[PDB]
């Protein structure tokens with residue numbers, strides 16, 4: 001018989017899963033179908049965003065990700081070398097998990113957690129709602145729901161799923177997207193690389209102090225990319241460029257000066273694409289993650305961008321499914337994220353270019369200081385190239401200010417409380433971040449007077465819009481937020497702020513919930 005759920009999530013990837021996690025906290029009926037059995041062959045994601053960690057903090061799986069296995073003492077450095085274990089050109093020291101100065105504008109510093117340890121962790125949090133070895137064969141929208149056919153690759157049986165909404169997180173090649181006939185045109189030249197995943201039990205030990213998280217190699221046209229430590233325990237990945245031939249083990253050898261054990265596990269080829277979808281949805285069917293926006297892996301914004309996009313669609317679907325959301329709300333999913341996707345895409349392309357552009361002087365490898373200062377050349381050249389930005393982008397992670405139909409709009413990135421932005425972090429208790437008050441429904445922070453808040457309470461009450469009022473008394477945070485009254489949304493972003501509440505409250509409410 002037909003399995004009927006509120007939200008059918010097509011795809012078990014990080015984004016599709018993040019969505020499930022959010023929906024879970026919002027008590028939304030959902031089910032996730034993943035064709036593969038659920039395990040990672042070639043781990044792609046390695047770095048989890050500070051903002052993605054704040055969300056996981058809410059969804060209660062952050063502690064886990066942090067302690068999933070990345071060596072607390074493993075360096076987080078990014079070094080530029082002629083050959084891993086050869087002539088070092090430049091290095092950005094970034095301490096270690098257990099050693100770096102705690103963040104400040106956030107309670108969750110970025111974490112390292114290779115996808116194969118991540119996938120499991122999430123699978124657990126999602127629990128029973130995840131259907132592995134289940135493939136979506138087709139779907140068809142009805143007047144008020146979507147019907148899909150899923151094959152149980154495992155028992156051979158094919159059942160139907162009747163969901164009220166279909167969120168497609170099927171990845172970059174997103175068949176769903178093609179089906180709906182939505183195009184995701186290239187915004188930058190599509191490139192090709194080969195990712196070689198290999199084990200090397202003695203490499204970190206041979207490296208010693210020289211150990212590092214990323215090794216950007218400066219050896220050739222195809223071998224001028226990073227070789228990164230996936231689990232800081234022997235697993236590495238040397239990404240190499242292509243031009244229409246070499247041997248896997250050969251390439252790794254080319255890259256590693258040491259003559260140590262080297263076991264090649266994979267040599268999967270991939271395409272670097274910079275493409276966002278013309279539209280983010282079509283009726284009761286939506287796109288999320290790479291399916292909606294896939295950009296360059298440089299600086300690792302991909303999943304994180306989708307996780308945010310995940311969180312956005314998250315509450316909005318819940319609002320609609322509950323009935324308090326205005327009919328225009330779901331539409332604002334594209335209105336707000338598509339732009340983010342694009343600014344994130346570009347910032348990535350920037351990182352990419354910083355490498356594609358950087359040239360390699362012919363006398364870079366040559367030993368002996370008679371052609372060694374040739375390195376001190378490109379050395380500062382990089383310093384100047386502003387390359388550390390590829391590892392420090394609070395702007396891309398915490399920045400993004402929505403400027404849309406449901407927002408009462410007003411150098412380096414800094415925390416703001418201005419409408420459309422992510423309410424900034426600040427400790428209410430050495431154990432409680434302002435960030436922790438948000439996530440469920442709407443929230444109204446009042447730093448001074450509690451005058452007129454009752455009116456606001458009633459206002460929301462009428463339209464059945466969930467609202468919570470917290471009366472804060474910290475002058476320090478009052479300053480951070482600036483205005484006396486700040487209305488944060490379920491997604492954690494400010495929708496309105498002012499020293500005086502509006503007169504036509506009803507109007508307000510109907511605006512922020514996509515009713516106006």
Ligand SMILES: Cc1cc2c(cc1C)N(C[C@H](O)[C@H](O)[C@H](O)COP(=O)(O)OP(=O)(O)OC[C@H]1O[C@@H](n3cnc4c(N)ncnc43)[C@H](O)[C@@H]1O)c1[nH]c(=O)[nH]c(=O)c1N2
Pocket residue numbers: 010011012013014015016017033034035036044045046047048049134135136137169170171172175195270288289290291297300301302303304305306
């Ligand atoms: C080399 C490299 C390195 C990185 C990255 C990319 C690359 C190429 N990224 C980008 C990141 O991997 C990407 O943004 C996410 O994987 C996207 O996740 P999704 O869940 O959206 O889809 P994803 O592409 O992961 O998964 C799609 C899922 O849908 C399933 N599926 C598809 N069609 C189906 C069907 N018809 N029926 C059933 N199941 C179906 C698939 O089997 C799969 O599980 C990254 N990002 C980041 O944040 N940090 C990082 O460190 C990196 N590093």
Ligand code: NA
Pocket residue numbers: 076094110391
């Ligand atoms: Na880092």
